[PDB]
Amino acid sequence: KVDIAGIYPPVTTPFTATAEVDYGKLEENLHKLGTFPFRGFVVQGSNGEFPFLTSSERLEVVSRVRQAMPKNRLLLAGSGCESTQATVEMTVSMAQVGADAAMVVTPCYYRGRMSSAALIHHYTKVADLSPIPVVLYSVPANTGLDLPVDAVVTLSQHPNIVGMKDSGGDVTRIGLIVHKTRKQDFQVLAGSAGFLMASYALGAVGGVCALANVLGAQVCQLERLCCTGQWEDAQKLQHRLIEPNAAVTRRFGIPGLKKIMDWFGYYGGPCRAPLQELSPAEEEALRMDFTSNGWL
Amino acid sequence: KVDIAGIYPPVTTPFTATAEVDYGKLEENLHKLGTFPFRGFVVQGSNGEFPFLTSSERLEVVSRVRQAMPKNRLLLAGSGCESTQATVEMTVSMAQVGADAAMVVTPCYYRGRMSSAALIHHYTKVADLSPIPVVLYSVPANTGLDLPVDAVVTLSQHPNIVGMKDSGGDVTRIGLIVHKTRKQDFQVLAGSAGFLMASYALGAVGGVCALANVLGAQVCQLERLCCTGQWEDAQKLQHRLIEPNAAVTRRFGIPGLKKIMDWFGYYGGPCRAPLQELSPAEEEALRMDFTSNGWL
Amino acid sequence: KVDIAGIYPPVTTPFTATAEVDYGKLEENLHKLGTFPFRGFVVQGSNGEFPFLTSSERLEVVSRVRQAMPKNRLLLAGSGCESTQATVEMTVSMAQVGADAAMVVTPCYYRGRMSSAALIHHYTKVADLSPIPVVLYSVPANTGLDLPVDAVVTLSQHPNIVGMKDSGGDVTRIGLIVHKTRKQDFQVLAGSAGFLMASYALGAVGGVCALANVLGAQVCQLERLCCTGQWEDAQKLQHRLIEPNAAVTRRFGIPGLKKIMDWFGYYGGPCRAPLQELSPAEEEALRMDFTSNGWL
Amino acid sequence: KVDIAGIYPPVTTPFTATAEVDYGKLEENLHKLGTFPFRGFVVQGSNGEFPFLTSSERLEVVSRVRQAMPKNRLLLAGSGCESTQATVEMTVSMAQVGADAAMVVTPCYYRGRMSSAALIHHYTKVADLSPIPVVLYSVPANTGLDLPVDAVVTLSQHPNIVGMKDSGGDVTRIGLIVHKTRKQDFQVLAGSAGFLMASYALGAVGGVCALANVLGAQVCQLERLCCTGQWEDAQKLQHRLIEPNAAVTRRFGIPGLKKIMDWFGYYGGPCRAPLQELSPAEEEALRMDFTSNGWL
Ligand SMILES: [K+]
Ligand SMILES: [K+]
Ligand SMILES: [K+]
Ligand SMILES: [K+]
User: What is the effect of changing residue 47 to A (chains A, B, C, D)?
Assistant: First the structure.
């Protein structure tokens, strides 16, 4: 199956002044981001505001991104839904419009009953029925749960489950996942630029990083430094990405990411309600996280 | 606007052996539950597996429940979605098929950015555009977040926001909400039978209780004892509902609730994947929580 | 053994300008607090800054309080240490200087290994070797842990373990503890004034309340209203104590409590380092919590 | 001031069958551990059961360890107490019996009031008054709190605060601390062997690792591989230390560590109550974590 190693920005969904998906701005942004040596794009991931899109919007976004992308760049499409059957259908439909692989977030509304066995069954079914490879996706900042290690190890054995994006930032956990799945075809990607160097050191083979929407060359440079054994230079660059990374993830989220996109000359624009614009104090804090690290 | 005081079971969604909504079993269960002096039914709440239904299923369930209900029983319909615009549309559509009021869960996927201001704006918009009264719904066991008190107080002032269901079980918080909204038309309902007596003592005026799907007469009796000042008898009954309540909520959730429904002669049946059947050990623990408190 | 029902303030330790224990101010405060119909005093509890005192100070504080107290008021002395053997020795020494009962906080530094069995063994040993009755004390805001219900139930069977102070504010948990220990001589006290009415409703028989250091008559009035079935008046008073209670506990802690003591004419004075004075903003917020509820 | 870079085991306190400190077994263990190229010993750290020792035992343990140690090995002594004044006195007394530096755990009982300012003031005072260099110590598994980054950065400026041991395992946080204190004389040590390689990659210069009590050569080898740029071999070794490290820290704690010490031929022996022996199931799980990684 495919090779998912490398760097991807999880791309945003631009909206118009009336909250419609702005496909013109989407295409413009993607053409700009195309200049960086990314493996591809993560589309309708958390940073894409997928919970705020209709079924049909979610599908058409994947379809349009496929058209604005080179054939040899990998389209990793967010197809995860709460129900297993809905996830199957979304995964099939996204494959049909050209997704190379399906990145499937853990169901999480019923967190108390999302046991290892439940999650194993969910992902096994999706992987069984998906015409494209499946990538597991654990993101406790949004879901309140880690996909358990025992479940990851079991799932890594499935022929159609090719890797995972872990956004939790626990490199002891990530190291253990790499180690325990070493006999399988199973590639681990970091879910943020803040712990990317450490992830590479522990055996992860790339990153899906919101920060790459604005510092794409720097995140790719970090990958290069890690892959060529330049760990001292990698350290220095990694250090300077920590605060800007926190700014567009844990601190200010997608509103922070879109604001910084605006300031860098991309179309950031509005989020969909209930997400709101940053307060002036938040804007200033966001600015400082970039300026004090030499990026703005 | 309506008076929402009283007891409601948040009704389940029965499914067939092929995971389709079983409307026959739904109607049969509702006719049975109709015998208890509930204020009404909460439909497509958390216990209804609403995240696992399609838009259309969610709507048709509300429509069918309205048909199987007396006109003077209150249909409180779960219309909450992640996006504000989707919530508006679902709320309008549910009103159109006969919902008396809309119970609107807090958006929660982007928990880090669900500030008081964001949630205020979300609920204000929905309440502005809803043709039926809005009931706030805070359930941190599923969402990972409490609707903040300051937001509740602000929202209580809206003419079209008539109350709240709090499932968090913090009676200091609930007491404070009652106290701070005392000048408004704003009725608080407990979200579980485990803290119902204490909620009444603090000024809540009812409960939406999963446990009422199986111990409806007992939950209604508890209401009666609290409303008539029989606090000593209320205490004894409340004590005996704690473990059975924990069993069908925090311990074993909807799978536990549906299993106990089966054992009591209702149609419990299967959950939709990814929810799974109880393990034999879990079944036994569930059984013990009911038997040791004299209910089975 | 004794009857521990009723209200107690957990008294502070006054310090001089040079951080020495101010026994003169201690005696003056206690004589003032003696006017309220408390069951007694909780001495060297969390609000007494016991972790900041030497062994000898902790003992001499209990000794001096005993001298400044009526013989028929109950001295409940905080004797809990991390180690079981140290707890035994402190409990014996405090008994020797006149403590009526020992209130024993859960060891908590090694929280990951403080299992039910470990805590059962700890309290069983202390109760075995203590010449005075033992009161369990669970306070997760300071310890990060709840004494587990199964451990409480087992321990309630010990002839020398006569009750518990629970500060966690979970009235479902407290209701369950009352219910499961109903066959034992085991009295439950709430650990704060914020959930006192609900605690009484669920079968607790009193409260150890930091707030009683400044609103002693009001907390005692609340007890009276609960014990005489005046639940409607109890509700109104309970509502008005919630914010002032939060102010001197979860919001501003002992520095908040001592500041309000100053403002009410008691000696509040300084805490021992590392505790610090309130910032001006914190002072103002503290003031507002009291003034907006009609107490200042 | 000293150079604290390198590996240290935080040594245990052996106890006799009657719970007395077994200084004979302590000396025997230390002589054995002396064979590894550690920088020194961490004495009366968390793994030493310091909360369970008397003042005098804590002091005499440091004194005896100093006697059983080479003059050129660094004695890093745990002198942290809840109160600032007690910490000062313990730090001075430990210096007097030969400690090279004082490792000072964050006060944590009053966690809600342990603000950055409070912790800054606490450590500034201790560092002002200590005749030996101070090492900050953050260990949220035991304290429930992280020493905040802003406080660490401020404190790193003090001439007598020479570094920190962080046990929290968050390499984004550790990377940020290294980066923000880069202009100061301030050395960061990892607090466990599970994230040691990643810590080195991010700019930490050593580790205080419970695991080094039993796999001292392996932890030192890991240091060597990181310091010589052998990251591929470092990865493989780091992977194999993760589960054994979890076993003697987060899973089974000091009882697990002492049991494995027994099995490796050291004196592990009993913990002080309330710590208990492992259950047979826990013993078996501990065994498996070592055997499945090739260490036993
Ligand atoms: K695979
Ligand atoms: K209203
Ligand atoms: K007893
Ligand atoms: K320094």
Answer: 6-fold increase in KM
